[PDB]
């Protein structure tokens, strides 16, 4: 027994519920496709879903405000947050080369009549920074000392493997100019 208006509200609620049937097929499709096809991960549906199982599917419509167009501050914050999350989820490297042995060989080869900042902490930090910056599309600037031609040698590989649009243009041109004018044109 309801007023017509109350009945309208309740009827709308009853007729437009957000719950939908859930099955192993829906769960499997919810798993990202690339992960499903990757042979490194074995996925099994070891659970039985009764017929009376429901779920509310997320609303994953792509952004309607286009915060990447003319929202510099908001986009900077968004990219920073995604970068933090990606850093959290990137794995940690294991059994790196012995830092002391590598430092000793580098010092012997370079014969510095440079080796500062080389260690496992820095290696892991760089791994995470690269992967997370690529995931979040955070622009990453390059910090280096032009006198450290070893750092420039490493930056050669950096630029080879990391797309050039991931670096702020000034930093990219600085690194490339240092490389050319201290190694390549000189050689």
């Amino acid at each position: 027994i309801l007023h017509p208006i109350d009945y309208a509200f309740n009827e709308y609620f009853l007729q437009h519920q957000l719950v939908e049937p859930l099955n192993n097929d829906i769960i499997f499709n919810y798993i990202p496709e690339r992960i499903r096809n990757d042979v490194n991960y074995i996925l099994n549906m070891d659970r039985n879903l009764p017929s009376t199982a429901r779920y509310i599917r997320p609303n994953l419509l792509q952004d309607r405000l286009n915060l990447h167009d003319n929202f510099e501050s908001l986009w900077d914050t968004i990219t920073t947050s995604n970068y933090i999350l990606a850093r959290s989820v990137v794995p940690d490297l294991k059994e790196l080369v012995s830092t002391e042995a590598q430092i000793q060989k580098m010092s012997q080869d370079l014969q510095l009549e440079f080796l500062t900042g080389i260690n496992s902490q820095a290696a892991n930090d760089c791994f995470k920074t690269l992967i997370a910056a690529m995931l979040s599309q955070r622009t990453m600037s390059l910090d280096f000392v032009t006198t450290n031609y070893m750092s420039l040698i490493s930056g050669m590989w950096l630029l080879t493997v990391v797309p050039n649009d991931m670096f702020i243009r000034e930093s990219l041109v600085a690194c490339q100019l240092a490389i050319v004018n201290t190694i390549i044109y000189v050689a």
């Binding site: 309208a8 509200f9 009827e11 709308y12 007729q15 437009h16």
Partner: protein, 397 residues
């Protein structure tokens, strides 16, 4: 008029779309429009009829809105909607008939019935919805003062005329030269005849002209021009110009020579076709001028030569004709064509309810008289009644 069209359009859409089992997402917007119409019409009182035999009717609106919370409509919803739809359709029907049956010599384009005058008010402007039919969109364009156009298939642009003109004549009608014509609906049949077959004419060629002016300019017209007037190719006994006596016409058909068809606008040749039959296009014209010659055959086999002697006794009369049919056209003003039923609807309503003859239209909505004397007031009233007829036909069948 826009409000009336919106009412009829809403009711037609409700009839078409509110059906059992249909998703409410299919008719959400329609039901919003229907509720808006009900809200706007509630609490208002209307009167229709009172002219001729059309009964005086009173309309009151105290309806309840329609539900908006089902996922799929059910039978209950359809019946609840239909009960209101019937009353609204009846109201629209009677308002349309009341508007059709009326006319005004001054400001014929404005509403004439009191119901439509009331709907002209600002309070009812909330009922507008859509204006997508040909006649309503032309109405709106005309009010906005832009170019309008109605596309007609076989437009009745020629007032019915059937007559002849004799350039050479005698009391005995034994030796005649002239033309005969029928201009009817969307066709012109003209036939120039000479009894002597141009025996004594200069260069044995007789020239014939026929000018048909139109009451309105036709644009982008497709026309069929054919070289024979089949209506004037058999023996006939016609009555003299003054009706005193009767004369005989025993035609023998020759090919029309030097056929020229000119379509003129403001007295200047816009299109011109020479010795070309079949489908032609007249882009913009208000007069059709047809010129054609009877040329005596320079060479005749004996059977042909025996027909045309050089003395008075003439038993066969050389005739050359043209037939011109306007298949399609576009006109700024409303007309009657072979495809639409608006003239039929208006005339049928007036005849059914025995409307006394008014100060504008001819008796019985005689299209021949109307298009003969197509005046500004007549055009305005005719467009108004045709628009109302289209609005009514959206609902009544």
């Amino acid at each position: 008029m826009d409000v009336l069209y919106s009412l009829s359009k809403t009711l037609k859409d409700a009839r078409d779309k509110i059906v059992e089992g249909t998703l409410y997402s299919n008719v959400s917007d329609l039901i919003q429009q229907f509720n808006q119409m009900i809200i706007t019409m509630n609490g208002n009182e209307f009167q229709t009829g009172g002219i001729g035999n059309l009964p005086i009717r009173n309309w009151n609106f105290n309806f309840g809105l329609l539900g908006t919370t089902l996922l799929n409509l059910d039978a209950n919803y359809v019946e609840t909607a239909r009960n209101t739809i019937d009353y609204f359709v009846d109201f629209v029907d009677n308002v349309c008939m009341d508007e059709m049956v009326r006319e005004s010599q001054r400001n014929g384009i404005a509403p004439q019935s009191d119901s439509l005058r009331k709907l002209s008010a600002i309070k009812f402007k909330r009922i507008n919805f859509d204006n997508s039919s040909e006649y309503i969109e032309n109405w709106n364009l005309q009010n906005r003062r832009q170019r309008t156009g109605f596309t007609f298939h076989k437009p009745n642009i020629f007032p019915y005329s059937a007559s002849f003109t004799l350039n050479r004549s005698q009391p005995a009608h034994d030796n005649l030269m002239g033309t005969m014509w029928l201009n009817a609906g969307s066709e012109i049949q003209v036939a120039g005849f000479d009894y002597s077959c141009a025996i004594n004419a200069p260069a044995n060629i007789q020239q014939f002209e026929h000018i048909v002016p139109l009451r309105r300019v036709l644009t982008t017209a497709t026309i069929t021009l054919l070289p024979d007037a089949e209506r004037f190719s058999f023996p006939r006994v016609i009555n003299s110009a003054d009706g005193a006596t009767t004369w005989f016409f025993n035609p023998v058909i020759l090919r029309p020579n030097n056929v020229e068809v000119e379509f003129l606008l403001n007295g200047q040749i816009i299109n011109t076709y020479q010795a070309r039959f079949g489908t032609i296009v007249a882009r913009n014209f208000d007069t059709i001028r047809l010129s054609f010659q009877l040329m005596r055959p320079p060479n005749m086999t004996p059977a042909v030569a025996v027909l045309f002697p050089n003395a008075q006794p003439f038993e066969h009369h050389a005739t050359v004709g043209l037939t011109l049919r306007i298949e399609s056209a576009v006109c700024e003003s409303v007309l009657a064509d072979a495809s639409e039923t608006l003239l039929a609807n208006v005339t049928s309503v007036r005849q059914e309810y025995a409307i006394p003859v008014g100060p504008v239209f001819p008796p019985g909505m005689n299209w021949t008289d109307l298009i003969t004397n197509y005046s500004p007031s007549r055009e305005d009233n005719l467009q108004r009644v045709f628009t109302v007829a289209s609005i009514r036909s959206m609902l009544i069948k």
